[PDB]
C-alpha cells in the first residue's frame, strides 16, 4: 500500500521490531547486545542503543543484516524515539584537510534514561539488564545453525 | 522399511472381434513395483497361457490391493524361478511378516540372495496367511512360543546423524572433531 518513494516505506523483517534485543554481529561493538529503537526513513538502517551504561553501545545506526534480532523484547512505547532523526547522524563535510557534540550527548542521555526505566519496569527487568551486559561469542563446539533465538 | 513390491489385480481381456464377440475376462495377481510392470506381466501371462497378445487386447482395470492391518503372521509363498541348468524350480517357503506384499518382497530378496534369481525369472504362484500349527519349518515355528524373548547382542548402535562425530574422547561423550 505504502508507495516505494514515501519515507514510511519499509521491507524490514518482523524480528527487527522496536524493542527487540539484538546481537551485534559486526563493527566495533561486535558480540554486544543492544535494543532496537527504530528504523530510519526510506528503508534506512536500524538505530540501536543498548544502554551505554550496560554494554557501552551508544546511539548508533546499524544495518539489519549485521544483527541477530532475538525474540526477547523490551517495551519501548515509553521511550520517545522521535528526536532520533536521519539528520542526527549526518555530519558537515571537511574542506581540504572522546569528542561528542552536546546535542548528541543530550540525546543519548535523555533516550538512555527512558530506556533504562523501561527495562526496570518490565518483568524480568533485572535478568534482562544483565542479559544486555553479556557478550555473545562463538565457542568451540557451538552450532548456531541449530539454535533458536 | 515398506515393501518394494505392490499387490496389483490386473483385469483384462482380448479385444472383441467377429470370431470372439464376448471374450473371456481374466483377473491376474501380480506383485510389481508399478502398474506398468504389472500390465507387462499380465500381458506376458496372457500371451503364454491364453495366446492373447497385448496388441489385440485391452485392460479393464489395473488397480492395487490394499494391505490388511499390520499383524505378525506366517505367510506361505508358493514361488517358482528359472535357471539355465536347472530349468524351472518351484518351491514353497514360509515367512514371518506383517503383510502379503512384505512377505512376497522378502521372498524375492531371499531368492535373489540364495539362488541368484532376478525379478523377471520369478513367478509367484500363491501367497497366503497360514496358521501357527501348519508351519513346517522350525526356523519359522520358533516364533510361535507364547513367551518368546531374547536380548539384543552385538548391536552397532549409530548416533543421530546430527550428533555423529569423527573424534570422541576415550571414555567421555565429548566430541573433538564433529
Amino acid at each position: 500500500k505504502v508507495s516505494r518513494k514515501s519515507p514510511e516505506y519499509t521491507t524490514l523483517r518482523k524480528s527487527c521490531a522496536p524493542g527487540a534485543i539484538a546481537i551485534i554481529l559486526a563493527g566495533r561493538f561486535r558480540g554486544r547486545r543492544a535494543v532496537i529503537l527504530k528504523q530510519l526513513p526510506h528503508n534506512g538502517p536500524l538505530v540501536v542503543s543498548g544502554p551505554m551504561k550496560y554494554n557501552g553501545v551508544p546511539i548508533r545506526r546499524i544495518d539489519s543484516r549485521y544483527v541477530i534480532a532475538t525474540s526477547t523484547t523490551v517495551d519501548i512505547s515509553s521511550v520517545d524515539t522521535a528526536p532520533i532523526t536521519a539528520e542526527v547522524f549526518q555530519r558537515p563535510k571537511a574542506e581540504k584537510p572522546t569528542l561528542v557534540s552536546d546535542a548528541r550527548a543530550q540525546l543519548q542521555k535523555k533516550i538512555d534514561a527512558a530506556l533504562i526505566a523501561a527495562i526496570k519496569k518490565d518483568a524480568q527487568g533485572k535478568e534482562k539488564a544483565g542479559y544486555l551486559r553479556s557478550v555473545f561469542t562463538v565457542k568451540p563446539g557451538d552450532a548456531p545453525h541449530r539454535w533458536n533465538w | 522399511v515398506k515393501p518394494h513390491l505392490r499387490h496389483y489385480q490386473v483385469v483384462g481381456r482380448e479385444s472383441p472381434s467377429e470370431k470372439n464377440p464376448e471374450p473371456t475376462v481374466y483377473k491376474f495377481e501380480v506383485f510389481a513395483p508399478n502398474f506398468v510392470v504389472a500390465k507387462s506381466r499380465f500381458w506376458r501371462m496372457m500371451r503364454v497361457k491364453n495366446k492373447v497378445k497385448a496388441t489385440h487386447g485391452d485392460v479393464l482395470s489395473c488397480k492395487v490391493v490394499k494391505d490388511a492391518k499390520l499383524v505378525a503372521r506366517n505367510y506361505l509363498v508358493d514361488i517358482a524361478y528359472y535357471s539355465q541348468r536347472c530349468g524351472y524350480t518351484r518351491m514353497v517357503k514360509e515367512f514371518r511378516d506383517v503383510s502379503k506384499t512384505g512377505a512376497v518382497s522378502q521372498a524375492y530378496h531371499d531368492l535373489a540372495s540364495r539362488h541368484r534369481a532376478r525379478y523377471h525369472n520369478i513367478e509367484v504362484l500363491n501367497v497366503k496367511s497360514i496358521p501357527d500349527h501348519e508351519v513346517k519349518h522350525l526356523s519359522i515355528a520358533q516364533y510361535h512360543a507364547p513367551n518368546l524373548s531374547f536380548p539384543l547382542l552385538q548391536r552397532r548402535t549409530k548416533a543421530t546423524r546430527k550428533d555423529r562425530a569423527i573424534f570422541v574422547k576415550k571414555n567421555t561423550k565429548r566430541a573433538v572433531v564433529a
Binding site: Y66, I68, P140, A143, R146 | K162, R164
Partner: protein, 96 residues
Amino acid sequence: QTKQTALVRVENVNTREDATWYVGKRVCYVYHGKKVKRCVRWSKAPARRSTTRALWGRVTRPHGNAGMMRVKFNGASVPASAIGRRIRVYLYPSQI
C-alpha cells in the same frame, strides 16, 4: 578441478540442512604477505596497517549430504596455498 568454486568444511556443520543455513554468508581467508601494503582504513585507522591480508567470498550452495559448502570468492579464485587452511564463515548477512 575448476578453481572458480571452492569447498569449505565448517566445524559442527555435518548435514546438508546445516549447510543450507550458511548459504549467502560471507567467507574470509586471512593470510599474510611479506610487505605492508594498503588496506581498508589505511588513513582512518593506522593501527590496521599490517602484512595481514584477507580474501572475501560468499557461500553459494551446499555440497553433498555431509555439510560441505561451495564458496565463490570475489572476482578471483582462492589460492591453492589456502588448501587445508583456516577459513572464517561469518554470521552475516543475517536472516534471523
